[PDB]
Each structure stands twice: as C-alpha cells, then as structure tokens.
Design a protein around this ligand. Structure first.
Ligand SMILES: Nc1ncnc2c1ncn2[C@@H]1O[C@H](COP(=O)(O)CP(=O)(O)OP(=O)(O)O)[C@@H](O)[C@H]1O
Ligand SMILES: [Mn+2]
Lengths: 166, 163
C-alpha cells in the first residue's frame, strides 16, 4: 500500500430501514438491485472507483474532487427516480490504499471522516467537508456553509458545506 | 434461489476511530489487516459465509444459529489478542438472497442493529436467536425491550454469557 491523496464519496439510502419495512422484502429487494445498478453506473461513469462497498450505500474514490462532486449530484437525481432518496457525504485526504487487482480497499481517518459526513447529510443532500470545498474553489460548484459539526472525538473540529445543486 | 432462513452475524471494531488517531494511518492499516484475516478465518472455520464488509467489520450468514454463536464468541477472544475489542450482533430470519454473494431484507437491518447496540467484547442477539437455540449449551441474559430504530415492534435483546 501507499499513502495517496483521494476524494472519497459515501452513499446512503434515507430511511432505508423504514423503507424496507413499509414495503416487504420482495419489493425492497428489487428496489435495492435497481439502486445499486444505478449508483454503481454513475460512479463508473465519472471515473470513480468503488472501494469496500458497505450496506445500503456505496463508498468510492475519485482522483478528481470535481468529478466526485459531479457524480454525487447526478446520483441524487438518478435515484430519486426510484421513489427513494439518497444522502451523500464527500471528503478528501491521504489514505492507506489496501489496493488489489480486485476490490482495492482504502483506510485511514479520512475514510472515517467521509462516512461521518454522509451520516450528517440530509435527504437528497450532498454534504462535504470544508476541505472538499477549498480545493475545488475556482470551479463551477458552489456550497453553503453549515458551521462546525464536531465529529466523534476526531482530532480538531470540522465545518461542513452543502452543495447547492441545479 | 429465494427467501431463505438464515442466521446473520454482524461484527464491528469498538472505537475504531480512537485507534486510528492514536496509531496513525500506517499502523491502523496493518492492524485492520490482521483483524480481517482473523475474523474471516473464524467465520470460515465455523462454516459461515461472508456477505462480507460492515465497513470496519463483517457480515456473515450461518446455516446453524449455534455455529454462528460459537463463531462469535471465539472471534471476541481472537481479536482481543490484537489489543482491540469487537462488538457483535446476531439475528435470524428469512432473507432475500441475491446478486452482484449478498443478502437483503429487514432481517439484515435488524442484525446490523443489534450489533450497534452491542458493547465492547459483547455478543448481543435478538430474543429470536436465543429462542431458536434454546436446548443448547449457550446461555443468555435478557436486557429487555429496545426500540430498534426504523423497526416495527420493540425487541428484546439478550447477551451471550461467556466464560
Ligand atoms: N448489507 C449490509 N451490510 C452491512 N450493513 C448494512 C447492510 N444493509 C444495511 N446495513 C446497515 O444500515 C445501517 C446504516 O445506517 P442507515 O442505513 O443510514 C440507518 P439511519 O442512519 O437510522 O437512517 P435513517 O435516519 O434515515 O433511518 C448500518 O447499521 C448498516 O450497517
Ligand atoms: Mn439508512
């Protein structure tokens, strides 16, 4: 492995648990396979790379912060077409790449920060660390600043920004 | 090929974020790799089938609730030998079996959730799994009624008593 700079994207179906319960396993299952084939499609489209992909959501790394943001914005719309909303979290940082000619994985506190931003993201909302915003500054993307959302005893403090889509 | 009865095991490292900070990404990565070889080995040992990551953790299905419970208690000890503790959650129910091995259904969400309620080096299970192995050597202590989030009902959770 090597320490590499990367932009990490985390996806999560909103009220996924209530959803499965209000639907039944048969329909829930079908809805899941649709979402996965969709999201996985967008990610690959925008040159992203799926890393370990966990639960009712995904995790992917992009070599371009802009791409990752474009992907996330497109995903939010493509899944809303299924009746379900997704919440997305993005972060960028160096990470240990447990890479492999298959399911190449990643690890480091950067990964935990991403996952943590995803959890704070609202329905059909793309949330990102101020880190992600500063580093694409100069691009067409714009964001609104939420403020400081102290993260699970993580060293320092973090501000989060919502991508203003359209 | 359809709806199947299964015992699902969810594992997760306790305070995996306090450990990475304290270790630094380099060491955290190696450890993580040791843990994964260990857990994955126990699961395979006890005939389990990984429907594999719960991020910093695993998810596996067993055709025998007893086996799954024996795998989980062995795991708790084998990882404590690395300096880190795991929390484990078990549940049993029918589940939708599928593609891209993977499983799905509200039973998976229930498991994933009695894992999050599990303490360090603790094996937590739904009253559902205590009930299905009643008659075996395993014993449990009852926590009471929890309102597992997003879930209908109000479940009773039980702690596996280990030596
Ligand atoms: N196949 C799978 N493998 C591992 N985990 C899975 C999984 N399917 C679902 N999950 C679980 O789904 C849960 C993740 O949190 P969410 O799914 O976002 C519930 P929530 O955070 O309460 O959303 P909500 O507030 O909209 O109800 C985790 O417990 C996760 O491990
Ligand atoms: Mn969810």
């Amino acid at each position: 492995a090597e320490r590499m700079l990367a932009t990490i994207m985390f996806t999560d179906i909103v009220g996924s648990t209530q959803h499965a319960a209000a639907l039944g396993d048969d329909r829930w299952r079908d809805l899941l396979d649709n979402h996965d084939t969709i999201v996985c499609h967008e990610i690959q489209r925008f040159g992203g790379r799926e890393v370990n992909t966990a639960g009712d959501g995904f995790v992917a790394t992009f070599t371009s912060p802009s791409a990752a943001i474009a992907c996330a914005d497109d995903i939010v719309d493509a899944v809303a077409a299924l009746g379900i909303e997704v919440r997305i979290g993005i972060h960028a940082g160096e990470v240990e790449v447990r890479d492999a000619s298959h399911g190449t994985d990643v690890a480091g506190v950067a990964v935990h920060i991403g996952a943590r931003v995803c959890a704070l993201a609202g329905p059909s909302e793309v949330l990102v660390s101020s880190t992600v915003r500063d580093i694409v500054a100069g691009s067409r993307h714009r964001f609104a600043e939420r403020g400081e959302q102290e993260l699970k005893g993580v060293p320092g403090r973090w501000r989060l920004c919502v991508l203003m889509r359209d």
